[PDB]
Amino acid sequence: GVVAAAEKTKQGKTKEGVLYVGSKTKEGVVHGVATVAEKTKEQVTNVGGAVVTGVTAVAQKTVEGAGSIAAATGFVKKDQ
Amino acid sequence: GVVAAAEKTKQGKTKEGVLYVGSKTKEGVVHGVATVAEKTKEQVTNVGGAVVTGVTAVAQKTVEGAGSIAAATGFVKKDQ
Amino acid sequence: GVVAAAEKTKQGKTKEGVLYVGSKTKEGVVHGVATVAEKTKEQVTNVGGAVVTGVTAVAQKTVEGAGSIAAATGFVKKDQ
Protein backbone atom coordinates (compact mmCIF):
# COMPACT_ATOMS: atom_id res chain seq x y z
CA GLY A 1 0.00 0.00 0.00
CA VAL A 2 2.54 2.56 -1.15
CA VAL A 3 0.48 5.75 -0.88
CA ALA A 4 1.18 9.40 -0.19
CA ALA A 5 -1.65 11.66 0.94
CA ALA A 6 -1.64 15.40 1.57
CA GLU A 7 -4.52 17.59 2.72
CA LYS A 8 -4.46 21.36 2.88
CA THR A 9 -7.85 21.44 4.60
CA LYS A 10 -8.04 25.20 5.01
CA GLN A 11 -11.22 26.66 6.50
CA GLY A 12 -10.96 30.46 6.57
CA LYS A 13 -5.31 40.79 2.47
CA THR A 14 -2.06 40.07 0.60
CA LYS A 15 0.33 42.93 -0.24
CA GLU A 16 3.55 40.97 -0.77
CA GLY A 17 5.52 43.38 -2.93
CA VAL A 18 7.91 42.72 -5.81
CA LEU A 19 10.65 40.43 -7.08
CA TYR A 20 13.44 41.53 -9.38
CA VAL A 21 16.21 39.67 -11.22
CA GLY A 22 18.82 40.96 -13.64
CA SER A 23 21.36 39.21 -15.79
CA LYS A 24 24.06 40.08 -18.31
CA THR A 25 26.43 37.29 -19.31
CA LYS A 26 28.32 36.21 -22.43
CA GLU A 27 28.12 32.40 -22.65
CA GLY A 28 25.71 30.16 -20.80
CA VAL A 29 24.68 26.50 -20.98
CA VAL A 30 22.28 25.00 -18.44
CA HIS A 31 20.80 21.52 -17.97
CA GLY A 32 17.88 21.41 -15.56
CA VAL A 33 17.21 17.75 -14.79
CA ALA A 34 19.17 15.32 -16.95
CA THR A 35 19.10 11.52 -16.72
CA VAL A 36 21.93 9.98 -18.74
CA ALA A 37 22.57 6.26 -18.49
CA GLU A 38 23.66 3.19 -20.42
CA LYS A 39 22.50 -0.44 -20.15
CA THR A 40 19.73 -0.02 -17.61
CA LYS A 41 16.32 -1.63 -17.19
CA GLU A 42 13.91 1.15 -16.14
CA GLN A 43 13.91 4.94 -16.14
CA VAL A 44 11.22 7.13 -14.59
CA THR A 45 10.86 10.85 -14.01
CA ASN A 46 7.69 11.85 -12.16
CA VAL A 47 7.34 15.62 -12.07
CA GLY A 48 4.67 16.52 -9.55
CA GLY A 49 5.40 20.19 -9.06
CA ALA A 50 7.12 22.31 -11.67
CA VAL A 51 10.49 22.39 -13.39
CA VAL A 52 11.79 25.80 -14.44
CA THR A 53 15.07 26.15 -16.32
CA GLY A 54 17.12 28.79 -18.09
CA VAL A 55 19.90 31.28 -17.60
CA THR A 56 17.15 33.36 -16.00
CA ALA A 57 14.72 30.94 -14.35
CA VAL A 58 12.40 32.11 -11.56
CA ALA A 59 9.60 30.31 -9.76
CA GLN A 60 7.16 32.41 -7.74
CA LYS A 61 4.25 30.95 -5.77
CA THR A 62 4.85 27.66 -7.48
CA VAL A 63 3.14 24.75 -5.72
CA GLU A 64 0.25 25.79 -3.53
CA GLY A 65 -2.37 23.26 -2.61
CA ALA A 66 -1.54 19.65 -1.90
CA GLY A 67 1.32 17.95 -3.69
CA SER A 68 0.83 14.20 -3.87
CA ILE A 69 3.14 11.71 -5.59
CA ALA A 70 3.21 7.98 -5.38
CA ALA A 71 6.10 6.25 -7.10
CA ALA A 72 6.86 2.54 -7.26
CA THR A 73 9.56 0.97 -9.44
CA GLY A 74 10.74 -2.63 -9.49
CA PHE A 75 9.01 -5.19 -7.27
CA VAL A 76 9.98 -8.33 -9.14
CA LYS A 77 8.88 -11.83 -8.13
CA LYS A 78 10.60 -14.94 -9.50
CA ASP A 79 10.51 -17.14 -6.39
CA GLN A 80 10.22 -20.94 -6.54
CA GLY B 1 2.70 0.20 4.01
CA VAL B 2 5.27 2.73 2.85
CA VAL B 3 3.24 5.94 3.10
CA ALA B 4 3.97 9.59 3.77
CA ALA B 5 1.15 11.88 4.88
CA ALA B 6 1.20 15.62 5.48
CA GLU B 7 -1.67 17.84 6.61
CA LYS B 8 -1.58 21.62 6.76
CA THR B 9 -4.97 21.73 8.47
CA LYS B 10 -5.12 25.50 8.86
CA GLN B 11 -8.30 27.00 10.33
CA GLY B 12 -8.00 30.79 10.38
CA LYS B 13 -2.26 41.05 6.23
CA THR B 14 0.99 40.28 4.37
CA LYS B 15 3.41 43.12 3.51
CA GLU B 16 6.61 41.13 3.01
CA GLY B 17 8.60 43.51 0.83
CA VAL B 18 11.00 42.81 -2.04
CA LEU B 19 13.72 40.49 -3.29
CA TYR B 20 16.52 41.55 -5.60
CA VAL B 21 19.27 39.66 -7.42
CA GLY B 22 21.90 40.91 -9.84
CA SER B 23 24.43 39.12 -11.98
CA LYS B 24 27.14 39.96 -14.50
CA THR B 25 29.49 37.14 -15.48
CA LYS B 26 31.37 36.02 -18.58
CA GLU B 27 31.14 32.21 -18.78
CA GLY B 28 28.71 30.00 -16.92
CA VAL B 29 27.65 26.36 -17.08
CA VAL B 30 25.22 24.89 -14.55
CA HIS B 31 23.72 21.43 -14.05
CA GLY B 32 20.79 21.36 -11.65
CA VAL B 33 20.09 17.71 -10.85
CA ALA B 34 22.04 15.25 -12.99
CA THR B 35 21.93 11.45 -12.74
CA VAL B 36 24.75 9.88 -14.75
CA ALA B 37 25.35 6.15 -14.47
CA GLU B 38 26.42 3.05 -16.39
CA LYS B 39 25.23 -0.56 -16.10
CA THR B 40 22.46 -0.11 -13.56
CA LYS B 41 19.03 -1.67 -13.14
CA GLU B 42 16.65 1.13 -12.11
CA GLN B 43 16.68 4.92 -12.13
CA VAL B 44 14.01 7.14 -10.60
CA THR B 45 13.68 10.87 -10.04
CA ASN B 46 10.51 11.91 -8.21
CA VAL B 47 10.20 15.68 -8.14
CA GLY B 48 7.53 16.62 -5.63
CA GLY B 49 8.30 20.28 -5.16
CA ALA B 50 10.04 22.38 -7.78
CA VAL B 51 13.41 22.41 -9.49
CA VAL B 52 14.74 25.81 -10.57
CA THR B 53 18.03 26.11 -12.44
CA GLY B 54 20.10 28.72 -14.22
CA VAL B 55 22.91 31.20 -13.75
CA THR B 56 20.17 33.31 -12.16
CA ALA B 57 17.71 30.92 -10.50
CA VAL B 58 15.40 32.13 -7.72
CA ALA B 59 12.58 30.36 -5.91
CA GLN B 60 10.16 32.50 -3.91
CA LYS B 61 7.23 31.08 -1.93
CA THR B 62 7.81 27.77 -3.62
CA VAL B 63 6.06 24.88 -1.85
CA GLU B 64 3.19 25.97 0.33
CA GLY B 65 0.54 23.47 1.25
CA ALA B 66 1.34 19.85 1.99
CA GLY B 67 4.19 18.12 0.22
CA SER B 68 3.66 14.37 0.06
CA ILE B 69 5.96 11.85 -1.64
CA ALA B 70 5.99 8.12 -1.41
CA ALA B 71 8.87 6.35 -3.12
CA ALA B 72 9.60 2.64 -3.25
CA THR B 73 12.29 1.03 -5.41
CA GLY B 74 13.43 -2.58 -5.44
CA PHE B 75 11.68 -5.12 -3.21
CA VAL B 76 12.62 -8.27 -5.06
CA LYS B 77 11.49 -11.76 -4.03
CA LYS B 78 13.19 -14.89 -5.38
CA ASP B 79 13.07 -17.07 -2.26
CA GLN B 80 12.75 -20.86 -2.38
CA GLY C 1 5.46 0.39 8.04
CA VAL C 2 8.04 2.90 6.87
CA VAL C 3 6.03 6.12 7.10
CA ALA C 4 6.78 9.77 7.75
CA ALA C 5 3.97 12.08 8.85
CA ALA C 6 4.05 15.82 9.44
CA GLU C 7 1.19 18.07 10.56
CA LYS C 8 1.31 21.84 10.69
CA THR C 9 -2.08 21.98 12.40
CA LYS C 10 -2.22 25.75 12.77
CA GLN C 11 -5.39 27.28 14.24
CA GLY C 12 -5.07 31.07 14.27
CA LYS C 13 0.74 41.28 10.07
CA THR C 14 3.98 40.48 8.22
CA LYS C 15 6.42 43.30 7.35
CA GLU C 16 9.61 41.29 6.85
CA GLY C 17 11.62 43.65 4.67
CA VAL C 18 14.01 42.92 1.80
CA LEU C 19 16.71 40.58 0.56
CA TYR C 20 19.52 41.61 -1.75
CA VAL C 21 22.27 39.69 -3.56
CA GLY C 22 24.90 40.92 -5.99
CA SER C 23 27.42 39.11 -8.12
CA LYS C 24 30.13 39.92 -10.64
CA THR C 25 32.47 37.08 -11.61
CA LYS C 26 34.34 35.94 -14.71
CA GLU C 27 34.10 32.13 -14.89
CA GLY C 28 31.65 29.94 -13.02
CA VAL C 29 30.57 26.30 -13.16
CA VAL C 30 28.13 24.86 -10.62
CA HIS C 31 26.60 21.41 -10.11
CA GLY C 32 23.68 21.37 -7.71
CA VAL C 33 22.96 17.73 -6.90
CA ALA C 34 24.89 15.24 -9.03
CA THR C 35 24.75 11.45 -8.76
CA VAL C 36 27.57 9.85 -10.76
CA ALA C 37 28.15 6.12 -10.46
CA GLU C 38 29.20 3.01 -12.36
CA LYS C 39 27.99 -0.59 -12.06
CA THR C 40 25.22 -0.11 -9.53
CA LYS C 41 21.78 -1.66 -9.10
CA GLU C 42 19.42 1.16 -8.09
CA GLN C 43 19.47 4.95 -8.12
CA VAL C 44 16.81 7.19 -6.60
CA THR C 45 16.50 10.93 -6.06
CA ASN C 46 13.34 12.00 -4.23
CA VAL C 47 13.05 15.77 -4.18
CA GLY C 48 10.39 16.73 -1.67
CA GLY C 49 11.17 20.39 -1.22
CA ALA C 50 12.93 22.47 -3.85
CA VAL C 51 16.31 22.47 -5.56
CA VAL C 52 17.65 25.86 -6.65
CA THR C 53 20.94 26.14 -8.53
CA GLY C 54 23.03 28.73 -10.31
CA VAL C 55 25.85 31.19 -9.85
CA THR C 56 23.12 33.32 -8.27
CA ALA C 57 20.65 30.95 -6.60
CA VAL C 58 18.35 32.19 -3.83
CA ALA C 59 15.52 30.45 -2.01
CA GLN C 60 13.11 32.61 -0.02
CA LYS C 61 10.17 31.21 1.96
CA THR C 62 10.73 27.89 0.28
CA VAL C 63 8.97 25.02 2.07
CA GLU C 64 6.10 26.14 4.24
CA GLY C 65 3.43 23.65 5.18
CA ALA C 66 4.21 20.03 5.93
CA GLY C 67 7.05 18.28 4.17
CA SER C 68 6.50 14.53 4.02
CA ILE C 69 8.78 11.99 2.33
CA ALA C 70 8.79 8.26 2.58
CA ALA C 71 11.66 6.47 0.89
CA ALA C 72 12.37 2.75 0.77
CA THR C 73 15.05 1.12 -1.39
CA GLY C 74 16.18 -2.50 -1.40
CA PHE C 75 14.41 -5.02 0.84
CA VAL C 76 15.33 -8.18 -0.99
CA LYS C 77 14.18 -11.66 0.05
CA LYS C 78 15.86 -14.81 -1.28
CA ASP C 79 15.73 -16.97 1.85
CA GLN C 80 15.38 -20.76 1.74
Curated annotation (Swiss-Prot), chains A, B, C:
Entry binding sites for Cu cation: 31
Keywords: Acetylation, Alzheimer disease, Amyloid, Cell projection, Copper, Cytoplasm, Disease variant, Membrane, Metal-binding, Neurodegeneration, Nucleus, Parkinson disease, Parkinsonism, Phosphoprotein, Repeat, Secreted, Synapse, Ubl conjugation
Tissues showing expression: Highly expressed in presynaptic terminals in the central nervous system. Expressed principally in brain.
Result of changing residue 16 to K: No effect on oligomerization
Repeat positions for Sequence: 13-22, 23-37, 38-48
GO cellular component: a single term: extracellular space
Post-translational modification: Phosphorylated, predominantly on serine residues. Phosphorylation by CK1 appears to occur on residues distinct from the residue phosphorylated by other kinases. Hallmark lesions of neurodegenerative synucleinopathies contain alpha-synuclein that is modified by nitration of tyrosine residues and possibly by dityrosine cross-linking to generated stable oligomers.
Superkingdom classification of source: Eukaryota
Record GO terms (molecular function): actin binding; alpha-tubulin binding; beta-tubulin binding; calcium ion binding; copper ion binding; cuprous ion binding; cysteine-type endopeptidase inhibitor activity; dynein complex binding
Subunit structure: Soluble monomer. Homotetramer. A dynamic intracellular population of tetramers and monomers coexists normally and the tetramer plays an essential role in maintaining homeostasis. Interacts with UCHL1. Interacts with phospholipase D and histones. Interacts (via N-terminus) with synphilin-1/SNCAIP; this interaction promotes formation of SNCA inclusions in the cytoplasm. Interacts with CALM1. Interacts with STXBP1; this interaction controls SNCA self-replicating aggregation. Interacts with SNARE components VAMP2 and SNAP25; these interactions allows SNARE complex assembly and integrity.
Name of this protein: Alpha-synuclein
Gene: SNCA
Residues represented out of the complete protein: 14 to 99 of 140
